[PDB]
Enzyme design. Structure first.
Site, PDB file in Angstrom:
ATOM      1  N   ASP A  10      18.088 -57.017 -16.755  1.00 52.34           N
ATOM      2  CA  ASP A  10      18.329 -57.263 -15.334  1.00 52.34           C
ATOM      3  C   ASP A  10      19.246 -56.172 -14.773  1.00 52.34           C
ATOM      4  OD1 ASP A  10      18.106 -58.493 -12.889  1.00 52.34           O
ATOM      5  OD2 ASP A  10      19.725 -59.956 -13.298  1.00 52.34           O
ATOM      6  N   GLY A  49      25.279 -65.214  -4.959  1.00 53.18           N
ATOM      7  CA  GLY A  49      25.643 -64.196  -4.001  1.00 53.18           C
ATOM      8  C   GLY A  49      26.572 -63.119  -4.526  1.00 53.18           C
ATOM      9  N   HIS A  87      16.921 -58.627 -10.460  1.00 53.01           N
ATOM     10  CA  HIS A  87      16.545 -59.819  -9.717  1.00 53.01           C
ATOM     11  C   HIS A  87      16.933 -59.735  -8.242  1.00 53.01           C
ATOM     12  CE1 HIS A  87      20.762 -61.313 -10.460  1.00 53.01           C
ATOM     13  NE2 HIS A  87      20.555 -61.914  -9.300  1.00 53.01           N
ATOM     14  N   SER A 122      25.681 -61.896  -7.319  1.00 52.77           N
ATOM     15  CA  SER A 122      24.577 -61.179  -7.963  1.00 52.77           C
ATOM     16  C   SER A 122      24.602 -59.668  -7.755  1.00 52.77           C
ATOM     17  CB  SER A 122      23.225 -61.707  -7.463  1.00 52.77           C
ATOM     18  OG  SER A 122      22.840 -62.906  -8.118  1.00 52.77           O
ATOM     19  N   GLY A 123      24.393 -58.917  -8.833  1.00 53.15           N
ATOM     20  CA  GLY A 123      24.310 -57.479  -8.755  1.00 53.15           C
ATOM     21  C   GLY A 123      25.633 -56.771  -8.621  1.00 53.15           C
ATOM     22  N   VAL A 165      32.157 -58.575  10.283  1.00 53.54           N
ATOM     23  CA  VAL A 165      32.805 -57.967  11.437  1.00 53.54           C
ATOM     24  C   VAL A 165      32.723 -56.467  11.236  1.00 53.54           C
ATOM     25  CG1 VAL A 165      34.910 -57.731  12.767  1.00 53.54           C
ATOM     26  CG2 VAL A 165      34.309 -59.904  11.780  1.00 53.54           C
ATOM     27  N   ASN A 222      35.361 -56.897   5.331  1.00 54.30           N
ATOM     28  CA  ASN A 222      34.803 -58.046   6.034  1.00 54.30           C
ATOM     29  C   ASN A 222      33.327 -57.785   6.303  1.00 54.30           C
ATOM     30  OD1 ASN A 222      34.140 -60.193   7.899  1.00 54.30           O
ATOM     31  ND2 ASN A 222      36.273 -60.248   8.571  1.00 54.30           N
ATOM     32  N   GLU A 224      32.580 -48.372   8.223  1.00 57.07           N
ATOM     33  CA  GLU A 224      31.615 -48.614   7.171  1.00 57.07           C
ATOM     34  C   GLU A 224      30.526 -47.544   7.210  1.00 57.07           C
ATOM     35  OE1 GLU A 224      32.287 -50.811   9.679  1.00 57.07           O
ATOM     36  OE2 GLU A 224      32.918 -52.732   8.861  1.00 57.07           O
ATOM     37  N   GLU A 238      32.828 -51.558   2.849  1.00 58.41           N
ATOM     38  CA  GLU A 238      32.856 -52.845   3.528  1.00 58.41           C
ATOM     39  C   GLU A 238      33.978 -53.716   2.974  1.00 58.41           C
ATOM     40  OE1 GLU A 238      31.831 -54.057   6.467  1.00 58.41           O
ATOM     41  OE2 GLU A 238      29.704 -53.852   5.896  1.00 58.41           O
TER      42      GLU A 238
HETATM   43 CA   LIG Z   1      32.904 -54.887   8.071  1.00 62.00          CA
END
Ligand SMILES: [Ca+2]
Lengths: 223, 168
Positions: A84, A175, A40, A177-178, A57, A54, A62, A52
């Site tokens: 799913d 959010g 989905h 999600s996944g 920022v 934050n 990253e 990651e």
């Molecule tokens: Ca960051």
């Protein structure tokens, strides 16, 4: 993650953010070129954000890698919510280090009662809206198929598990999600859906990853 | 005693505010309501009331709630629903909800008139609210059917859509 805690930086190095201009889904790094997520979360263009902590920022270390291939499960149905699960092939292999690492696929299914770690950047409020900049964490048990099917009568297939608390208060949310549900170093769940957030007798529902290990390894080796 | 409908921050609904209609469900069966093109529709304007297949992509088209009288929004009180978006005069009516056993929700309606389609927001059997269509108990629960693979809002008196109202 409602009622979770802020993860110690880089303590969840397999966690990824899927970005379409903004953070919209979590995922998990299973090898250096592939991420597993929920179907989905499909979108035609995805930037994978690794290492990651934050998400608002840019620290500097990253890795931002575009998806080269986005494969939803061929028997995914978006209204039965079955199957799913999704695979994302990185357009270039990711650099593995202390901040970016892989999580193992299940070598068995996880028994009810097993403590798992859920993580993601979704909502932290049961009612309003309060999305964090820092990765959130929650430890929660795998629920019994009996208690999962009583909380969601007639909605649970054999490919979903409930993780969390019948009492409420702690749960994944919009959010997350996944994102990963990691249980003894094994990816057993993918945040899939819920009814409300951290409400009584309404735990989060997770795609049962152990039902897909064959599809994952075979789809990876064919693409 | 009249019970005001509340938004997701506990605040009563205000006819001057805009809200997205959001699912109580989230993730794979999240998905806010939006204004979309009906399949094989002659209109030049989008004329269907849909909801997304998940809540991780686009956000709902905002709506406003026009009470037939007063300036509060109460449970079980009659009202019209209008998407609140920049549009030309031709498509104004095509922002206003109306209904076309399964009856699809569309736009093309009018506001505050005898020919308008009125709805009621009632408390849900679980969490949140349901919408009722009231051709003015003889009202009809608003839910979802699948039409060309999309979630289309429609009259279904089994399994209504549990919704919340998030202010824009
Ligand atoms: Ca960051």
């Amino acid at each position: 993650i409602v009622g979770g805690y802020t993860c110690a930086a880089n303590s969840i190095p397999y966690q990824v953010s899927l970005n379409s201009g903004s953070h919209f889904c979590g995922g998990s790094l299973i090898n250096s070129q592939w991420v597993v997520s929920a179907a989905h979360c499909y979108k035609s263009r995805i930037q994978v954000r690794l290492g990651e902590h934050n998400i608002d920022v840019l620290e500097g270390n990253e890795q931002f890698i575009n998806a080269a291939k986005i494969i939803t499960h061929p028997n995914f149905n978006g209204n039965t919510l079955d199957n799913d699960i999704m695979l994302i092939k990185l357009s270039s292999p990711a650099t593995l280090n202390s901040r970016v690492a892989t999580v193992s696929l299940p070598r068995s299914c996880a028994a009810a009662g097993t403590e798992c770690l859920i993580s993601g950047w979704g909502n932290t409020k049961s009612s309003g809206s309060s999305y964090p900049s820092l990765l959130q964490c929650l430890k929660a048990p795998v629920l019994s198929d009996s208690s999962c099917k009583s909380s969601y009568p007639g909605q649970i297939t054999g490919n979903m598990i409930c993780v969390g608390f019948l009492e409420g208060g702690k749960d994944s949310c919009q959010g997350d999600s996944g994102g990963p549900v990691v249980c003894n170093g094994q990816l057993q769940g993918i945040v899939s859906w819920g009814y409300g957030c951290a409400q009584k007798n309404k735990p989060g529902v997770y795609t049962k990853v152990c039902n897909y290990v064959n599809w994952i390894q075979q789809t990876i080796a064919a693409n | 005693l009249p019970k005001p409908v509340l938004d997701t921050n506990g605040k009563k609904l205000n006819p001057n505010s805009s809200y997205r209609i959001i699912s109580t469900f989230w993730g794979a069966l999240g998905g806010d309501v939006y204004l979309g093109k009906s399949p094989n529709s002659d209109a030049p304007c989008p004329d269907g009331v849909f909801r997304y297949n998940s809540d991780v992509g686009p956000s709902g088209t905002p709506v406003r709630f026009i009470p037939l009288s007063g300036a509060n929004i109460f449970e079980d009180q009659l009202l019209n629903i209008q998407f609140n978006i920049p549009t030309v005069k031709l498509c104004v009516s095509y922002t206003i909800w109306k209904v076309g056993r399964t009856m699809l929700l569309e736009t093309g309606g009018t506001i505050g008139q005898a020919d308008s389609s009125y709805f009621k927001i009632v408390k849900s059997s679980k969490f949140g609210y349901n919408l009722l269509y009231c051709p003015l108990n003889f009202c009809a629960k608003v839910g979802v059917v699948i039409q060309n693979g999309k979630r289309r809002l429609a009259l279904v008196n089994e399994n209504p859509l549990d919704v919340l109202f998030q202010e824009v």
